[PDB]
């Protein structure tokens, strides 16, 4: 079935061993930074589930490297666009992650400069949506700037529950050097957070990209028209209603370009 | 050999037929844009060989679609930071639309913000990557606003050394130049009737020799094969524990 195919392609496991998943992912982070010779990692901490989990894994990874005699550091960075509605949750996340370094970069001035320039050049005002993507892509630039200046790798937060819908910004939050959450469903991510002892609030808030000026904190589920419980059931191979299968398989097919490098005439995935 | 593996992985042909390459690459653009149902393409025009070639192919592609009764447009955009060659490229490409977006104010806002937030000045090298990534945002902003696909200028001679900014000029939706070495691209521009001025630690001709399957000194192949290995991350999606190419 297509469900089984998508499951394989996204590396999802119907049932997991929380402790073992954490070791595998921390071990991957260690192996990768060791191979590349990088000084550590950098990641934007939004206060949301995904960055909280990836962030804690990163801190654990560098603490493990130092413990064994190596050198590594993790820079957690707040990337608010002006005043962030849920800054308090981002602070709670930082409190849990306990990163080596806690930095901050307000992207508003950069996004405003770009937005003002766009209107000046074209006479058109960016739609709230397109301006939102400028925000997501500016956060990418900020993390890579810190990464290039400090010699760190940029961590990405993509996972199966996001990959299946393609709900992320190409070259924005989708742009990163390595991904510790690949294959995890949304509920499985929560399970790892539980194993890591995160404060319940960090995994009970509605997932949101929060990129719109006119509709801040817009939930993923509202925009997608499907819940994470349905998405996770589908990914974990459970028996789901036909409506869920049709919806997800349609989105997966349409967003394949987001999961592949740029298309060339030698590729067949787009035909 | 490693040279054969790389040659194969980058889709390089030792010998090419200029006219058919143009036909195949124009047909690729047409086929992809129709499949996705997009309204056309957008590409930053720098005045350099690569963007001049990709741009002309893009324009030929949209004119062909319209000739066959479809709807398509190509937006060529200048992305200066704060020119004659670019102007010349535009005169040759003859795009449906000619836009411009000065990235200066954006990069400056970012640079000043970085300094005030970290107390550190953005070095020249890192600021350069910011400029490249800002051009990416600019092209994608236009693409998102106008329903257009972002074209990339990547080719074999550029891919092998991985010398391009990840998520900068490396960020695009489709690549019409894949597989071509630097001189083959030059050959295509020549066949397209482009003026000489437009198509004219290691040299490009040396790199093209390696890619096209010619004999090269150890120092060369050694360096190129190592450069390739260390920049593989630029030719793949973000690395996960399920990947092995980085090992
Ligand atoms: N305001 C912000 N501050 C810092 N980083 C941010 C940010 N908004 C987005 N990011 C970065 O972009 C990534 C993607 O964001 P999201 O898609 O919303 C997942 P999340 O926000 O981390 O958990 P979530 O599903 O609870 O929303 C985040 O994990 C984070 O690295
Ligand atoms: Mg996300
Ligand atoms: Mg979020
Ligand atoms: Mg300092």
* Domain boundaries along the sequence of chain A: 1-271
How far apart are alpha carbons B134 and A114 in whole angstroms?
Answer: 9
Centre of ligand 4 to C-alpha A150, Å, is 11
How far apart are alpha carbons A113 and B31 in whole angstroms?
Answer: 37
Pairing of strands B149-150, A40-44: unpaired
Q: Does B112 touch chain A (CB under 8 A)?
A: yes
The residue ranges of DSSP E strands in A108-188, in sequence order, are 153-154
List, in sequence order, every residue forming a beta bridge with B239; answer none if it has no partner: A178
How far apart are alpha carbons B138 and A106 in whole angstroms?
Answer: 20
Could you tell me if A182 and A160 are in contact, meaning their C-beta atoms sit under 8 angstroms apart?
yes
Cα distances (Å, whole numbers) of residue B138 to A61, A138, A173, B87, B97: 36, 11, 17, 19, 16
A69 Cβ contact list (under 8 Å, min separation 6):
none
Give the torsion sign (CA, A218, A223, A229, A235): negative
Closest CA to B53 of B63, B62, B43: B43
Could you tell me if B99 and B146 are in contact, meaning their C-beta atoms sit under 8 angstroms apart?
no
| Residue B47 backbone class (left: φ over 0; alpha: ψ -120 to 50; beta: rest) | left
Element (H, E) at B43: strand B40-44
How far apart are alpha carbons B140 and B52 in whole angstroms?
Answer: 19
Could you tell me if A3 and A237 are in contact, meaning their C-beta atoms sit under 8 angstroms apart?
yes
How far apart are alpha carbons A45 and A67 in whole angstroms?
Answer: 24
Rg over alpha carbons for chain A, rounded to the nearest Å, is 19
Q: Is A48 in the pocket of ligand 1 (CB under 6 A)?
A: yes
Could you tell me if B133 and B169 are in contact, meaning their C-beta atoms sit under 8 angstroms apart?
no
3-class secondary-structure state, position A237: coil
* Superfamily name with CATH number, domain A1-271: HUPs (3.40.50.620)
3-class secondary-structure state, position B99: strand
CA A155 from chain centre, in angstroms, equals: 8
The residue ranges of DSSP E strands in A90-245, in sequence order, are 101-104, 153-154
| Residue A197 backbone class (left: φ over 0; alpha: ψ -120 to 50; beta: rest) | left
The token pair at B16 is 């090419």
How far apart are alpha carbons B239 and B8 in whole angstroms?
Answer: 22
Considering only CB atoms, which chain A residues are within 8 Å of B146?
Answer: none
Closest CA to A75 of A6, A159, A131, A155: A155
Centre of ligand 2 to C-alpha B90, Å, is 39
Could you tell me if B29 and B176 are in contact, meaning their C-beta atoms sit under 8 angstroms apart?
yes
Considering only CB atoms, which chain B residues are within 8 Å of A50?
Answer: none
Give the torsion sign (CA, B172, B140, A134, A150): positive
Q: Is A252 annotated to bind ligand?
A: no
Topology of domain B1-247, CATH? Rossmann fold (3.40.50)
Length of chain A equals 271
How far apart are alpha carbons B153 and B49 in whole angstroms?
Answer: 10
Rg over alpha carbons for chain B, rounded to the nearest Å, is 19
Count of CB atoms situated within 10 Å of the CB of A240? 18
List, in sequence order, every residue forming a beta bridge with B100; answer none if it has no partner: B78
Report resolution in angstroms.
Answer: 1.9
Edge-to-edge order in the sheet of strand A40-44: A101-104, A73-78, A40-44, A153-154
Query: What positions of B carry a catalytic annotation?
Result: 50, 158
Could you tell me if B117 and A75 are in contact, meaning their C-beta atoms sit under 8 angstroms apart?
no
How far apart are alpha carbons A105 and A44 in whole angstroms?
Answer: 10
The CA angle A58-A64-A67, to the nearest 5 degrees, is 145
Q: In A40-62, which positions are buried (b, 16+ CB within 10 angstroms) versus exposed (e)? A: bbbbbbbbbbbbbbbbbbbbbbb
Closest ligand 1 atom number to CA of residue A80: 1
A225: exposed, middle or buried (C-beta count within 10 Å: 0-12, 13-18, 19+)?
Answer: exposed
Closest CA to A29 of A67, A72, A68, A75: A72
Could you tell me if A147 and A124 are in contact, meaning their C-beta atoms sit under 8 angstroms apart?
no
How far apart are alpha carbons B155 and B179 in whole angstroms?
Answer: 6
Facing residue for B122 by CB, picked from A112, A145, A262: A145
Count of CB atoms situated within 10 Å of the CB of A164? 25
How far apart are alpha carbons A227 and A240 in whole angstroms?
Answer: 12
How far apart are alpha carbons A156 and A259 in whole angstroms?
Answer: 13
List, in sequence order, every residue forming a beta bridge with B43; answer none if it has no partner: B76
The token pair at A205 is 């808030």
Give the torsion sign (CA, B95, A117, B49, B233): negative
List, in sequence order, every residue forming a beta bridge with B98; answer none if it has no partner: B76
How far apart are alpha carbons B167 and A47 in whole angstroms?
Answer: 25
How far apart are alpha carbons B211 and B181 in whole angstroms?
Answer: 7
How far apart are alpha carbons B48 and A196 in whole angstroms?
Answer: 52
């Amino acid at each position: 079935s297509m469900q089984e195919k998508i499951m394989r392609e996204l590396h999802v496991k119907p049932s997991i061993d929380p402790k073992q998943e954490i070791e595998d992912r921390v071990n991957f982070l260690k192996q990768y930074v060791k191979k590349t010779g990088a000084k550590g990692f950098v990641l934007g901490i939004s206060g949301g589930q995904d960055s909280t989990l990836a962030g804690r894994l990163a801190q654990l990874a560098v603490e493990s490297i130092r413990e064994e005699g190596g050198d590594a550091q993790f820079i957690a960075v707040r990337l608010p666009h002006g005043t962030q509605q849920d800054e308090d949750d981002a602070q709670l996340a930082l409190k849990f992650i306990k990163p080596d370094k806690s930095w901050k970069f307000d992207i508003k001035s950069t996004v405003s400069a770009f937005s003002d320039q766009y209107q000046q050049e074209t006479g058109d005002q960016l739609t709230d949506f397109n301006k939102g993507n400028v925000k997501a892509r500016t956060r990418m630039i900020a993390q890579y700037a810190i990464g290039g200046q400090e010699g760190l790798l940029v961590l990405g937060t993509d996972h199966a529950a996001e990959a299946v819908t393609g709900f992320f910004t190409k070259y924005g939050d989708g742009g990163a050097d390595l991904l510790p959450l690949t294959g995890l469903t949304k509920r499985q991510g929560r399970t790892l957070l539980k194993e890591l002892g995160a404060p319940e609030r960090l995994y009970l808030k509605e997932p949101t990209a929060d990129l719109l000026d006119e509709k801040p904190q817009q939930s993923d589920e509202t925009e997608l028209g499907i819940s994470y419980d349905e998405i996770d059931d589908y990914l974990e191979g459970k028996e789901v209603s036909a409506k869920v299968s049709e919806a997800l398989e349609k989105r997966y097919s349409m967003t394949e370009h987001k999961r592949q490098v740029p298309a060339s005439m030698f590729d067949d995935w787009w035909k």
